[PDB]
Write a protein that binds this ligand. Structure first.
Ligand SMILES: CCOC(=O)CNC(=O)CN(Cc1ccc2nc(-c3cc(C)c(=O)n(C)c3)n(CC3CCOCC3)c2c1)C(=O)c1ccc(N=[N+]=N)cc1
Length: 127
């Protein structure tokens, strides 16, 4: 069950630019989900080797996790909020299409996604 290289988390030739939305995504959205009791399965890429999941990276074409998202926000990898929101959505979608609906991991994803969507509802104006 081989692990792919983790997604890129630094862009060596992108200018450093804050926005109200990117500040919000790091300091409100990521920080709130990261400290949640159910965060830990999402804080790093799925280690298919350690968890013995030979089919995980066969089924999941676009791997994503909050560890990667946190590093991307800290490294100012995202040009805008929408790329970051897409990464959260991909992470949740991966969980829902791979794991059985009645799994603990899916209830954990649903709790984090509820919190995510509530915070995105109050996303600052594009400015
Ligand atoms: C000899 C080989 O033995 C092993 O496999 C050892 N590997 C270990 O350490 C495994 N763990 C910890 C661990 C860390 C991160 C994970 N991330 C996931 C996970 C999977 C899948 C498909 C997925 O889609 N996403 C997004 C994440 N899982 C699976 C679980 C499946 C159940 O629900 C919660 C996620 C993780 C597992 C544990 O065993 C462990 C879990 C909870 C504990 N709490 N207590 N008390 C204590 C330990």
């Amino acid at each position: 069950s081989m692990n792919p290289p983790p997604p890129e988390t630094s862009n060596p030739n992108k200018p450093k630019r804050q926005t109200n939305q990117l500040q919000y995504l790091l300091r409100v959205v990521l920080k709130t989900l990261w400290k949640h009791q159910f965060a830990w399965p999402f804080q790093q890429p799925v280690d298919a080797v350690k968890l013995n999941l030979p089919d995980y990276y066969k089924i999941i074409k676009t791997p994503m996790d909050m560890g990667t998202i946190k590093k991307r926000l800290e490294n100012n990898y995202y040009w805008n909020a929408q790329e970051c929101i897409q990464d959260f959505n991909t992470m949740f979608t991966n969980c829902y299409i791979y794991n059985k609906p009645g799994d603990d991991i899916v209830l954990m994803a649903e709790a984090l996604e509820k919190l995510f969507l509530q915070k995105i509802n109050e996303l600052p104006t594009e400015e």
